[PDB]
Amino acid sequence: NDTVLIAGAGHAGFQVAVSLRQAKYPGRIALINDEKHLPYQRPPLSKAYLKSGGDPNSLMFRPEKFFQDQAIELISDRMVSIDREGRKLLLASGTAIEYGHLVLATGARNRMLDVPNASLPDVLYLRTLDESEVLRQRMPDKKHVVVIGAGFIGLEFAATARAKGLEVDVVELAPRVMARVVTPEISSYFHDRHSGAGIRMHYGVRATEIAAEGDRVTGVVLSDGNTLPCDLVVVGVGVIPNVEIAAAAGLPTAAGIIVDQQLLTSDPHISAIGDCALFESVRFGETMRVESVQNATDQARCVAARLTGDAKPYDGYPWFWSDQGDDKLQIVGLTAGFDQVVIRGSVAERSFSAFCYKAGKLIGIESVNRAADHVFGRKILPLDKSVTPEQAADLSFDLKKAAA
Ligand SMILES: Cc1cc2nc3c(=O)[nH]c(=O)nc-3n(C[C@H](O)[C@H](O)[C@H](O)COP(=O)(O)OP(=O)(O)OC[C@H]3O[C@@H](n4cnc5c(N)ncnc54)[C@H](O)[C@@H]3O)c2cc1C
């Protein structure tokens, strides 16, 4: 067959469809979308949107007419099974489709809070437009929310809930916030900023039970035995890559759908991109899964480029960002295994960067309200070039000249 079937119409799904057309792909392109919304943006969900008037499709990538003009078949359905041998995609509507090449961009789903009463009505998640909209409408009728999970999303939400007048308590099991993604100097800064806004941070604890009265949430019980009163709970304790269906078809999976340097599964005719993909990284010499718009986007481009001619190893350089309250956090590079951190700028001035090193080499830059340092990293890191810790701290050391 000639048709390219895309399962999942989020960032990666939408981008591969678009990039496929830009590259003048002749075949048919079907985009399976299991949500009652035109493909939309995720980043605004825990940011601006929570502050908007809730405009139905204000987060749409492109308007409805776009998919028609682009010959991208937008199918309002969901894949449930994959017939690799018959190269057919089995939808839930009962329908079935043959494919030349199958692109899996199923992303990842919320990991359910595994605690008593965790499923009461007032225990909400925050990852889909729908979930964002209910939370937006629910906050005005709530006085106190406990946020479980100090990840990016949880804090982006916490600041807004606080800004709206709600009482806010953040529950994190680790000793500091964003422990899975940033170095201590960043956690510290944000701990101060949020605390300063009146948000009460709680470290070293897990939720062990959701205290309720009738079926009304009244608090969150912690592993230290104490209970934090609240009438609303927002949980962000991780996701689960959607690999089930692919695994059901015999495709290797783990913490994501396994793919090689070219984002291909063990079955040619089937690729995996975005949050759902556990790819082989030539640059970093290891298999990993990355959750970011950058990753979804660059991976989509890589596949689109392959299915149209030049098959190259995926090498989208990783970078992320987060908008918490009035502060902007930008990260370029992977900081895992950092053994030396240098501060450039001033924490007091609320504009600085943490230059992270490992074995004497710059591995990443975490910039708070300092776009210039981020541009420096985005240019230098992909080239695998570095700057000494001494130079990073020196405000008289010109980053523009260094990156020319
Ligand atoms: C609230 C929020 C804020 C974020 N903010 C940022 C940010 O500021 N910066 C950043 O870099 N990243 C951010 N991210 C992460 C970013 O959204 C993800 O990295 C990106 O969406 C991953 O793209 P994706 O295409 O793989 O999957 P997603 O966008 O999640 O889309 C997956 C889509 O596939 C659908 N689907 C799943 N299974 C099936 C199936 N079997 N059949 C059909 N359809 C299916 C899903 O319902 C969904 O619509 C944020 C994420 C969230 C949730």
UniProtKB/TrEMBL annotation:
Pfam families: Pyr_redox_2, Reductase_C. One of its GO terms (cellular component) is cytoplasm. FAD binds at H11, A12, D34, E35, R42, K47, M79, D275, V293. InterPro entries: FAD-oxidoreductase/Apoptosis, FAD/NAD-bd_sf, FAD/NAD-binding_dom, FAD/NAD-linked_Rdtase_dimer_sf, Reductase_C. Keywords: FAD, Flavoprotein, Nucleotide-binding, Oxidoreductase. GO terms for molecular function: ferredoxin-NAD+ reductase activity; nucleotide binding; oxidoreductase activity, acting on NAD(P)H. Residues 319-402 form the Reductase C-terminal domain. Its EC number is 1.18.1.3. It comes from the Bacteria. PANTHER family: APOPTOSIS-INDUCING FACTOR 1, RIESKE DOMAIN-CONTAINING PROTEIN-RELATED. This is FAD-dependent oxidoreductase. It comes from Rhodopseudomonas palustris (strain ATCC BAA-98 / CGA009).
